[PDB]
Write an enzyme that holds these catalytic residues in place. Structure first.
Site, PDB file in Angstrom:
ATOM      1  N   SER A  32       0.680  -0.821   0.139  1.00 53.97           N
ATOM      2  CA  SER A  32       0.190   0.277   0.017  1.00 53.97           C
ATOM      3  C   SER A  32       0.673   1.362  -0.331  1.00 53.97           C
ATOM      4  O   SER A  32       1.983   1.239   1.318  1.00 53.97           O
ATOM      5  CB  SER A  32      -0.688  -0.088   1.209  1.00 53.97           C
ATOM      6  OG  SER A  32      -1.527   1.304   1.372  1.00 53.97           O
ATOM      7  N   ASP A  84       1.729  -3.716   5.827  1.00 54.82           N
ATOM      8  CA  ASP A  84       0.602  -3.203   4.678  1.00 54.82           C
ATOM      9  C   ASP A  84       0.674  -3.271   3.533  1.00 54.82           C
ATOM     10  O   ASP A  84       0.559  -3.416   2.429  1.00 54.82           O
ATOM     11  CB  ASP A  84       1.432  -1.619   4.794  1.00 54.82           C
ATOM     12  CG  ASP A  84       0.779  -0.776   4.015  1.00 54.82           C
ATOM     13  OD1 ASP A  84      -0.656  -1.234   2.953  1.00 54.82           O
ATOM     14  OD2 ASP A  84       2.105   0.385   3.666  1.00 54.82           O
TER      15      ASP A  84
END
Length: 161
Positions: A35, A77
């Site tokens: 991300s 993430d």
């Protein structure tokens, strides 16, 4: 919890998928997704919001895969996707394009606030890049680093690094 399989589970599916691929003449790919600008989002919006984003990202990734494909969270993430069996590298790039295109739509938070993020993907292929799980993962990892480096919200195919 995103309810997605963890790293350990992912490494298992990989080993067996790698065998299947070698046994019968086939190709498989490992995609790494990071991300974009995750830290800044946490600082500015908090970890609670970060989670809501991860969850949403998890669905957006899964909703773009074949029931044969696998999606797991490497942690924090980052996500790891298994593309097996693949008929060619073009398909792997095709799926990545789709994953990055699904993030183009803003993410609605729990309080009405919107958050737009990008996905950086590093694509490792078998047997072109690596012949084993470890290396294939390391390759997808490094290719995913350079992408973050070169540009974000982009996909990148590993090559000698």
């Amino acid at each position: 919890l995103t309810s997605l399989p963890n790293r350990a589970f992912f490494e298992g599916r990989l080993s067996r998928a790698l065998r299947d691929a070698n046994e019968h003449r086939e190709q498989l790919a490992v995609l790494f997704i990071d991300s974009d600008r995750f830290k800044e989002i946490n600082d500015r919006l908090g970890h609670a919001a970060g989670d809501t984003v991860l969850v949403n990202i998890a669905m957006r990734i899964r909703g773009q895969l074949r029931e044969s494909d696998l999606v797991a969270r490497l942690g924090g993430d980052e996500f790891a996707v298994l593309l097996a069996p693949l008929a060619s590298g073009a398909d792997a790039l095709r799926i990545a394009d789709n994953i990055i295109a699904s993030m183009q739509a803003p993410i609605r938070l729990s309080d009405g606030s919107t958050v737009s993020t990008s996905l950086t993907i590093g694509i490792a292929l078998y047997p072109e890049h690596a012949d084993t799980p470890a290396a294939l993962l390391h390759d997808a990892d490094m290719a995913m680093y350079i992408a973050k480096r070169q540009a974000r919200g982009s996909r990148r195919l590993a090559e000698l690094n």
